[PDB]
Every structure is written in C-alpha cells, then in structure tokens.
C-alpha cells in the first residue's frame, strides 16, 4: 500500500520519528529505514513493537559514507515517501554556513540516490536549513531529469507547532488546532499571521513577543540544552505528521490543507515560499494564496521573502556548482 | 486531574516515553519530567508541541548525583504516577554485579524520595532489573510505612509486546491483540501463554523457537546495536502504553486488564510474579488466576518461578543492606 523511507532513521530525530510513524502508518503500511550506522539496531527495536500489517525494512550504509551507496539503491525501489532527515542538527559548534555545506551535499547525495530508483516518489524535507535544502533537492531532481514541483515538500510544520502552543498557552482556554505560518523556516524568515486564526488577541506588545517567540525557538531549545543538542522531540513530531499527512493524501484518505516550504509554480515572485497547499493523490493538489494580512504581517513578509530569495540562490548555486 | 512524572526523562528510553505520553496523556494533564541532567532540555522540546491543556513541569537534579535531591523533592508534589526509568548504562569496565548495584540504590533513592512527599501515588517500575527492582521499591516503602501492594507496578508489558508482534508475524493475517506473558521479566522468567490465545498454533517445534525469541529478544537488539546500546524505542512504547493504562485506571476512564510484575498478596507462593491484573480507581483492583496452561508452559513457569524467587531475594537483599 505505502512505502515510508526514513533517511537518517538512526539519528535522535530519526529514531523518535520513526517511531511515531510505525505507531500511525495505516495497516498494510512499510516502513523502511536507512542510516549510515545504526539502522538494524533501530529497525530490529522497532519490528518488536505489536503492530500488525507493518513491515519494518532496514538498510546500513557504509561508514565512512560512500556516494550512491548501494545499501540505499536497495532500499529505495518501491518507496512512496523519501522522509530526508540525515545530516547534522543545529547544535553548538557548527555555524550557520557550515551546517549548509555538509548537509547541502548530504541531502544533493540522498535525494540523487532515492529519485534515480523512485522517480514518483514524495520528497518530505527536513534536513536543515530546509529553505536551501528544499531548492538543492529540486536542482538535484531536475539535473536527473525527475523534477515533479508537486512532490517536493520542505517541512516547515515546526514553525506552526510553536505558533500554535504560544497562542494557545496565552490565550486558554481559548484554543485553536493551527496558525499559519508563511515565508520561510528561519527567524529572519517565519512570518505567523495571528490575525488569520479566530478569537481576540492580545494586545501588539504581547503579539511582537510572541511572533519573535516562534521565530527563535529553535535557539531557546538549545539554551535550555546547555547547548547540548537541539530540537528532536518535537522535531520528530512535526515531521511525523506532516508524512502522515502526505500518506493521508496519497492513498486518498484525505485531502489536507497544510502550511509547506514548496516550490510556487509562478504564484509568487519568491521561487520557494512556505505557503498553504491542499495535498492529493499526486502531492500538491492546490497553491492557495496566503490570505489577507495585517499591515505589520506584510512588513514581516516582505523582509522574510527578501532573504528567503538569497537563501534559495545560495542553494541552487551550490547545486549547480556541484551538479 | 493527573500529574503524572517520568523520572529519568532525558536518557534514550525516557526522551521517547515523555514523547509518548506528551501525544496521549488526556487534556488537563500535567507531565512532570526529572533527570541529573537535560531535564530543562527536554521539557523545552516537548513544550513546544501544540497540545492543548497540557502542562509540562521540569526540575533538575544535582549532577553529580546527589541523595534525596531537593529538586526532585519538589516536583513529586503532587504526582499520581511515578515512571521510574533511571537505570545507567553498562560502561565498559563495570562488573555485572556493579550495574546491579547503581540501579538497585537508584531505584531506592527516587522511590525512597518521590513517595516521601507523594506517598499515595503509583510506581511504575521501569528501571532494570525489574524482578528485583520491583521488591527493592516495595522494601524501600515499607521502611518509611507507605508501601500500598496495589500501586507499586514492575512494567513488563514489552515481553508481551514482542510475543504478540512473534506469533502475529508467524500466523498473519490471523491477529491478536495481546498474549499473556507470566513470571519474570528476563531471560528464563519470561513464560508466554500461546495457549490461551485464540486461533491454530504453529507446531511445538516453531512454538519453542518463537517462545525462546521472546526470551532472548533483549539481546537480540543489543546484536543489533553492535553492543553499544539496547532497545529504547520498543521500551517507550510499552512504558507509556502501561502508564497509560494506569492512568486511565486512576481517572474514572477504563478497568483494563494488564499483566505486570506486582506483589501476589496472598495469591502466589512467590511474592512477585508477572500476573494478570485489573487496574481500577486505588491502583490493583483484582488479582487474577494465571488460568489454564500447557504441561510445557507449565514446567517453564516452574523453572521461571524457582529463579523469580532468587531474583526477589537478591533484591531485598540490598535492600536490608543499605536500609
């Protein structure tokens, strides 16, 4: 029925992720698993829980990592759903360039490897920063000539998580499921637009505190870690839900309006915009336009967009330089 | 309306069974998560998530460990169900009777504080050894007057887990959601009851291979993992699935049926033995016969219970030890 490939099921976000999909995955479902180290580990303590109708396929690549790895070529046939989660976290220790050269060639390697067996599969992107890994994973795709814009999908669905925990804990017992959240996957970048969910809100002093909230929680993880680590719990979950929703959707279940980092087929001037889109059988059924915003949301807007459109450009210019 | 702490909550096992039961705990509930270290971390990560009327509490202990932590002090206040899962990992250069002996005066610390201050609440029992951790907490009860035989818990669960997930694998798409497992929680003390299950049996031979399996599942993760860790994801899944149980248990919202390792009363010539149960309101609400079983299930639960019997008495052993 469905093929769910986890890459990078190993690492602390993969594990946790992976397990949130074998606990939701329908019936009929696979689940398949590939790291560098430790996948058999993760898929043997998976395959013990008692689920019925799943099967838990694994795959080890070779450590030191080997492009193309035959492992993964395996792996990928038959897949529906390329879950990219390899690739280093933000934690301390790696700035904001470094993280994008190691994990821009990772996720360029990964995606090569899993579209040149299964072409019509979904690409959920999360490896960071997913603004420039989303527009690499699409250069890689066209370069092999695969290149479905309904069908790659960078996952920005954190953002919305936070978004939505912040306003409820202010405003309880008024709640709401979401909030839109538009532009990118970056402080500089996330843009919440309150004014779109119903109810009163707090006054603007109060708001301001909490858009910059959803924006640097990220960095709030990572000092409540003592630098330790970053976000891999609830990382976990936003990528979990969003693969269910893209699961959902391909086997009919659901048509469900979600908030994704995607490419915008000429609705907007921005090339990627995390924007509203209802997912089908065939990924991306419709681009929605964003909706009316307040006059400080457009301003938020626009200086994400800006930067938005260089991060993109910095990612298709090391695509292209490394074809 | 239930307050429920996972003490341990920043370890492999911990992080994931926080995970879980920050997914499913019921609106209303509060999760209260403690560790030496990473607690702020976790607690962090895991408020992130939009759930809705749920609090999530944090208090972090001295490292390196201190005794009756005041922090830990703190946070017992008001707890219903204590999710013991602290054990250490064995370090290369540690006898198999050191790790015994850190996990057994972990156990005593966090029982001996948790229910100084929350004397009424459950304990699930998750750190291992739990055949004998499980007397070690109940000892460390009675020394202070507060032990209750009826919410003192060793979880079991993942051996049923893993010898439903067996025979469901070995008579697909004849399924069943649980098998009884009786005895202990380890290697010779774990005895499933195929026979009360419903449904055709694979022959004798494949049975006794498939009950083995069950046994020596532990270890074939940590092959798995190369030895350098054991089952984490399988064990979060049958922590906060137990705890669940309790939970619901402990609200008006179920009765349910659970096998665990838990005091016999009068029932057993052994004190503690992986049984039957039904959880109510206070914890035990009945103790349930074993039930009919096979001559060969029969004698396996003879030798289980002849070293179940050592396991207890090695553990309150310590106990006496240390007081």
Known sequence: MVNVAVIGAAGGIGQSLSLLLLRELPF??????????????????????????????????????????????????????????????????????????????????????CASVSPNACFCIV?????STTPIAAQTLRKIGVYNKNKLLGVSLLDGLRAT?????????????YVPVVGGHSDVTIVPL???????????????????????????????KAGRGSATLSMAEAGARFTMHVVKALMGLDTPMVYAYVDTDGEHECPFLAMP??????????????????????????????????NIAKGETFARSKL
């Not at 490896?127 to 603004?131: D, L």
């Not at 419709?286 to 200086?303: H, N, Q, W, Y």
């Open 127 to 131: 490896t960071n920063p997913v603004n």
């Open 28 to 113: 009929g479902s696979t689940l398949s698993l590939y790291d560098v180290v430790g996948a058999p580990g993760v898929a043997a303590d998976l395959s013990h829980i008692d689920r019925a109708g799943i099967t838990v396929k694994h795959a080890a690549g070779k450590l030191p990592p080997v492009p193309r790895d035959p492992a993964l070529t395996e792996l990928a046939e038959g897949v529906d759903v390329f879950v990219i989660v390899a690739g280093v976290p933000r934690k301390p220790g790696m700035t904001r360039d470094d993280l994008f050269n190691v994990n821009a060639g990772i996720v360029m390697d990964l995606v090569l490897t």
């Open 194 to 224: 309150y004014s779109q969910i119903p109810g009163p809100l707090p006054d603007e002093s109060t708001l301001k505190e909490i858009r910059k909230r959803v924006q640097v929680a990220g960095t709030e993880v990572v000092k409540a």
């Open 277 to 310: 889109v209802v997912l089908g059988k065939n990924g991306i059924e419709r681009r929605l336009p964003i909706g009316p915003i307040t006059t400080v949301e457009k301003e938020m807007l626009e200086e994400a967009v800006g930067v938005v459109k260089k």
């Open 165 to 177: 925990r912040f306003i409820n804990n202010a405003r309880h017992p008024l709640v709401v499921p």
